[PDB]
Design a protein around this nucleic acid. Sequence first.
RNA 1: GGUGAAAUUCUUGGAUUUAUUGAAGACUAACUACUGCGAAAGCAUUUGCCAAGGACGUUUUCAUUAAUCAAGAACGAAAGUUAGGGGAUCGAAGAUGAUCAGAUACCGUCGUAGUCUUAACCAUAAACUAUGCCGACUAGGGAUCGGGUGGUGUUUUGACCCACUCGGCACCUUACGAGAAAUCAAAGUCUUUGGGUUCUGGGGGGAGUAUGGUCGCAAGGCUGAAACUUAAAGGAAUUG
Lengths: 201, 91, 127, 150, 226, 96, 97, 25
Amino acid sequence: SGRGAPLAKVVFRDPYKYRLREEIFIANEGVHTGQFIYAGKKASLNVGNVLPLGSVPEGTIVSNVEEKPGDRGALARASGNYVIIIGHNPDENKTRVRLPSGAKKVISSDARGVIGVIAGGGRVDKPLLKAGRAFHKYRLKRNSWPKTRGVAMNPVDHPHGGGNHQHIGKASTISRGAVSGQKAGLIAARRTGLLRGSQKT
Amino acid sequence: AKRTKKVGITGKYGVRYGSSLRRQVKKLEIQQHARYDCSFCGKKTVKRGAAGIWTCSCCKKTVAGGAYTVSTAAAATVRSTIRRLREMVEA
Amino acid sequence: SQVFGVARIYASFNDTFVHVTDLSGKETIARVTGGMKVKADRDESSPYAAMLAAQDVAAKCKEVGITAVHVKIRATGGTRTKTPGPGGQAALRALARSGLRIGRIEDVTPVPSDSTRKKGGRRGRRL
Amino acid sequence: GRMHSAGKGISSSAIPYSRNAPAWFKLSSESVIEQIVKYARKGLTPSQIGVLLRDAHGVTQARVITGNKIMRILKSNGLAPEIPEDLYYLIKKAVSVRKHLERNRKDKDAKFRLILIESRIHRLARYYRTVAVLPPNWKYESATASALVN
Amino acid sequence: AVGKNKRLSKGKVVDPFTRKEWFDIKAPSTFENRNVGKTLVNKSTGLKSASDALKGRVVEVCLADLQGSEDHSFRKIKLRVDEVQGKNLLTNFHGMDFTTDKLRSMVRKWQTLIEANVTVKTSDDYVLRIFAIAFTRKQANQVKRHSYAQSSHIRAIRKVISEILTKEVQGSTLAQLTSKLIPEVINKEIENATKDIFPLQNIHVRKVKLLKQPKFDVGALMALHG
Amino acid sequence: SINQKLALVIKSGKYTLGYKSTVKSLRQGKSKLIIIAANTPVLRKSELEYYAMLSKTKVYYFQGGNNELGTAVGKLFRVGVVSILEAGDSDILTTL
Amino acid sequence: PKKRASNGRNKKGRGHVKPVRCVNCSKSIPKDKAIKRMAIRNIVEAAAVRDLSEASVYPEYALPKTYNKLHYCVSCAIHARIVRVRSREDRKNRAPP
Amino acid sequence: MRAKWRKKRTRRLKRKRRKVRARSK
RNA sequence: GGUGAAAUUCUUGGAUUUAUUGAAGACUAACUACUGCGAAAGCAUUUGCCAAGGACGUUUUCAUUAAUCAAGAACGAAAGUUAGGGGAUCGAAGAUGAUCAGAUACCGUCGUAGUCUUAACCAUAAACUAUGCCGACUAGGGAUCGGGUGGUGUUUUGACCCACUCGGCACCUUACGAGAAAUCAAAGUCUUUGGGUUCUGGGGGGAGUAUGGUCGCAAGGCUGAAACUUAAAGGAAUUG
């Protein structure tokens, strides 16, 4: 509930006492029931396996990458999202990766990850026709819907409120030194307007 | 007989919601209520449960996949790539 | 016996560069162009301006300790002309007549395989 | 010229003026029928029987030695195919192009080629329904043609 | 122009060559001539070093100068400074390429052009890309005015060239490959095998360039300089 | 082409399609060859192999699924394993 | 009326010919229609040959050559005197000068 | 006037007759 | 830097130029031709996989199954549209510097949509050979692409060389012939008018416009008049 991507319950075997230990994963596409999942430093390069980032070639596509070795998953956990692997730095024990947002990072080679692309992709390309379908979406997320506009309020409630017309009256762009109660609008905006051109990332 | 000429499944939504948004929804609903192949047993009995969960009644097997189809174009590319890298690096 | 450097001559229309470097190419020794010997823009590509410039790099090179140089003649290249400008031959002539020995000569314009698009449009410069 | 192209080649065989068996042929006519029947017993089509019999044995052509055409010998013995042999090969080639298109949906030339082949299939099956070798109402349906060949 | 400078600065002298010195370049031992030239650098101040600037600058030479004959004057060699020893530098093989003039003269029209490139790793863990070129030649007593080749011919020629190149590059070290390029041996290999397919002229190894290098081991380098 | 050899066996010789008919054939020693679909599950494929080890019969792995093996034998339904009992006029047993 | 039997180009048995760009005015003209010449010249011009030989640090150094192939559109071919208007009978001639 | 630009003018004219008439319809 | 010459612009806070290194997108030079393939639009780096095709060879098989087509359908440059991705170059719009009587143009520098890919629309062009398709016949000469036959030709049947043949892309000479001519081996075998067949035109404008349909999200595509006006518009050559 509340999570776009499906989960997968993989059950490993306790290596120090006689019992089973079930773990909750986030499924990657193609992972079906009954599949064997191998996790370690010497696992194969197949979809569903957990390998360190330094044990895969360039161009590998991974998911649920931990940003320090042992966090248990940080970086690609939404639906349809993945992480690309650009290069290796043997002399510093680091690996360069591309994140969903388009940013580059350097993280330890011992950081783990799962191979593939998170399941349940294409979710946000089907419209929500009705206010009812947004009502039930956030009913299992949290209390953030409906949203009232600041400019439809009185000045006692929001910085934007008030006036014989609905208008702001001051620039919507707000400084990063602003205090609580002032940050409403575009906080620390580097630009504004319709985005024309190349991203220039 | 052909009951609707172009509204098809989306006819339930009435005159509501504009034509562009009803064409868009029609494309994906037809994908999520179809039946696919269970490659493990050849039968065409793969339906959708929740989003991303594809179930077949014959085997009681479930396969993770897209929100509206079994396989997306992005996953397939990764599948072929991994076959190439694995079959290229094991040398 | 002979101390060798390299002389790069960029003979373009609208200007000409004459500058010498070490054999490795990381340290420059003397640079002087045609635009620091004339007072009108249309003359920056003339043989005379290139000739005066080459005599200055000949001056500085001798006083740094060089007695011979290879030659690398270039034009703009790429999507541009790919033909030597007017001042290339004057510069090479001037270096020789300044008592600075000459080794190998080579043309190093960047030829683009097949390239990005060329400016001017589909109908070209209508003039 | 060609039915579905601009080719105008004139290549073809030229059978001898003489309708009599060559003087150097000695093995009997009934012996040759034994070759035909045992070859069809292992699947070879009428065209293949003749080739294998021309460049391994001396049979210039069955019509001159045995007295009947290869096909007419086969049907008398009961080896006649279910559908004529030239139709069988046009269908077999339509199955291959269709199977190729299911995988490559951007192959706009294989689509066009498939239109030409299926057009040849219909023009020919009509000839066969008139002379009553195929039963009337025989129809080449794409979804089911795979069964016919195999 | 002289007097067209608008503003010198965005706001409102020491002679450089009084603080430099000359080092002496040394080639690897695979070549006969060990001296190639000299080069400059600023002297080692307290906060900077000469070594950190002398490393990695590449010097382009001619194999004719390193072998003593100007018949070998259409190839070029590149060398990379790997270690600074006193006042003289020590360099190592880096690549090889034809001169622009030589390559263009080979490409005349009325003849097909065959190329082949192979990526192989030598026995001492270098990675190389070797390029090859060839042409087809008008035969004696030929009346036809052009000497083209069918694509069936070109594909076979490109298969033979690739395999001789892989064979001759792997199984040998980078120094051995260098000593093997000088006599132009590989050309004779290619033609002796391609002769039965189509007569060719101007078989050459156009260029060789390094893609990766193994972990530096000083002792290995000294073997080519002692 | 394997398919052309299958067709001649179906027309001339005799065969048994389906899993349960195959195990009965192997047990009685009748089987001459068995042909397994590519996507027969791993457990069942193993069970067929062990039987064939005891009866000393050959195993050929077809390059296709149930649907493809069925159309190869010319049946509109899907066949997962076929066992040859008499070769008829085909050279399947002594070839491949 | 029809002026040339080749339509001013060299396309027969071909639908399309990809284009190139003129070297003077930067305009696209199909490859088979463009006027094409080869300009090969010693790198060191004739008047400078003596000085360079006297300056060479070698004996018997062969002068390198520069090669390039030039494409002109019709407008820039007429102007640069590469081709010139030609009479009726004299248009059919193919043999170079 | 050039045949090409006459075609363009007529097209821009029709586009406007197509929207003035849409007021009544 | 830029031009015929210049100005805007960038530059002592180091531009232009030199070296080493890396990222991204596009493109596929020279070889490249009176050469190749495809129904046309079109197609040029290496290799693997999938299916397809012409010509040639054939003492293989069927035996008239054929030719051309109203309606109907597949593909269909560029620009254009809808949604993701990519976005290096060039660049409708836009902004600027200069010329000019004006310059909201040509020239110089920026620059969004576009350019490229996936999914889906459009259905257009000087989409030209301004030349419909199938068949037979009629003049001379050489060069070239594929296949086949003869020459144990010659170099060391692969490459060439000579003769012949079939199928192509074309080319040179000529007029028995055609044409108003320009020209044409088809545009010939048509007043000595008949091999089979499909499509279109009837002086120039109004007009590919109005209106009615039908297709398209839109731009628009296909079908397509009338009143009125007018003695000329037009094709190829000749002398100025």
